[PDB]
């Protein structure tokens, strides 16, 4: 089968397969822990780009931190090199283009190192000789470091030989020039990976706070006690319960927005559901189902529903 845990023995000669298999098992082990709390432990942590060369049909990444569904974490800030420039010459006829970060499949039958020899498929690993600092003392030595053979591909291309993750979307200007679509949301590992979603989430919280502060002042009091409840209070206190319960929960998720969107979705869906109990224009099926691959089909319609529910 796929992983061969090495047995370490006293009279054994050390083999590269022992270290490759142990590393593969550790990746699987960390992934199995992530799966205990999350259904989709893969996606984008950071996907930052340089837009300067877009008029010249070129897209360059500046920072990429992406976890693939096989448990492989790529990090250009720490362990990996940036992928080569994405050439847009082939999409001059298009109005929209989905940019994916591509990691070649790991081949269980070998040949994963891109050594310059000919291959019918892309190879996952690249070797770079780096003068690596020995951490106990002061010496440095040239060591073959694994660099993931990452490329920026497009979703309309044939990508079966790679593991892919949406990383941006390019749309056309009024002038017909390519630009990053601000509405784009990649599969998320952190809420911070999407600046537009963050803006929309901060807006929801501020709207919730404003509506609840207005509603809290609307509570009728006799002396310093709540006045005997009228029919209008049934709706008022139901609404207040929903906003007061959700606000501190949403605040701490948004103040440190570095966690998985499943946590946020759960609380946003709970709040939406609670707000739907008075509305007759929206049924309970109005809450968008969680879709990890396309967060655009979950967070924008859910935030739209919530803002409509808060105002009505």
């Amino acid at each position, epitope marked *: 089968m*796929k992983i061969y845990r090495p047995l370490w023995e006293d009279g054994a000669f050390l083999m590269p397969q022992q270290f490759q298999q142990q590393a593969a098992w550790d990746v699987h082990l960390a992934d199995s822990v992530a799966r205990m709390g999350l259904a989709h432990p893969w996606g984008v942590v950071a996907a930052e780009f340089d837009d300067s060369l877009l008029p010249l049909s070129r897209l360059n990444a500046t920072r990429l931190i992406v976890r*693939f*569904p*096989d448990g492989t974490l790529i990090d250009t800030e720490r362990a990996d090199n940036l992928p080569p420039v994405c050439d847009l010459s082939t999409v001059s006829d298009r109005s929209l283009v989905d940019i994916v970060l591509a990691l070649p*499949l*790991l*081949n*269980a*039958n070998g040949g994963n190192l891109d050594n310059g020899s*000919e*291959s*019918e*498929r892309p190879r996952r690993w690249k070797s770079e000789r780096v003068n690596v600092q020995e951490l106990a003392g002061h010496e440095q030595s040239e060591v073959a470091v694994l660099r993931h053979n990452l490329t920026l591909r497009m979703a309309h291309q*044939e990508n*079966a*030989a790679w*593991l892919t993750c949406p990383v941006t979307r390019l749309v056309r200007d009024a002038q017909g020039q390519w630009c990053r679509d601000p509405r784009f949301i990649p599969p998320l590992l952190t809420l911070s990976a999407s600046p537009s979603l963050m803006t929309e989430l901060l807006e929801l919280l501020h709207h919730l706070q404003a509506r609840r502060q207005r509603l809290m002042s609307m509570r009728r009091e006799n002396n310093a006690r709540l006045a005997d409840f009228a029919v209008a209070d049934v709706s008022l206190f139901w609404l207040l319960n929903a906003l007061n319960s959700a606000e501190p929960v949403l605040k701490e998720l948004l103040d440190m927005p570095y966690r998985h969107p499943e946590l946020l979705y759960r609380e946003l869906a709970r709040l939406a559901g609670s707000l739907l109990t008075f509305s007759l224009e929206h049924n309970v099926d109005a809450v968008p189902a969680y879709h990890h691959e396309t967060p655009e089909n979950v967070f924008p319609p859910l935030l739209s529903l919530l803002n409509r529910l808060l105002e009505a």
Partner: nanobody
Amino acid sequence: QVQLVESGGGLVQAGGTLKLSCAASGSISGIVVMAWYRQAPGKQRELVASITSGGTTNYADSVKGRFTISKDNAENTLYLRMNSLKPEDTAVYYCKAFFRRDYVGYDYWGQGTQVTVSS
């Protein structure tokens, strides 16, 4: 798994033509790319030509413009049309399938077929 059987090999005169066939069976939906490799006597295995499931072709500089790789999707058969055959093309030709399963790649090979360029 994927099973590959080559046919069409044989004896050809220099400047001649041959068409190799490779019947693919089993879990064909997992096939990503198919290729033709060759091993000449006393030489290392060399990739000849490759074709993705979508039909994108690639050739070694040594055979480019002389060889044509094609695939019949309906019959699950891989072909290699070889023109202007030269003595240096004499080798055992192998069919290869690069297969994927749950984010992992696998290689499947054929038994090989002998090709002899002579007079």
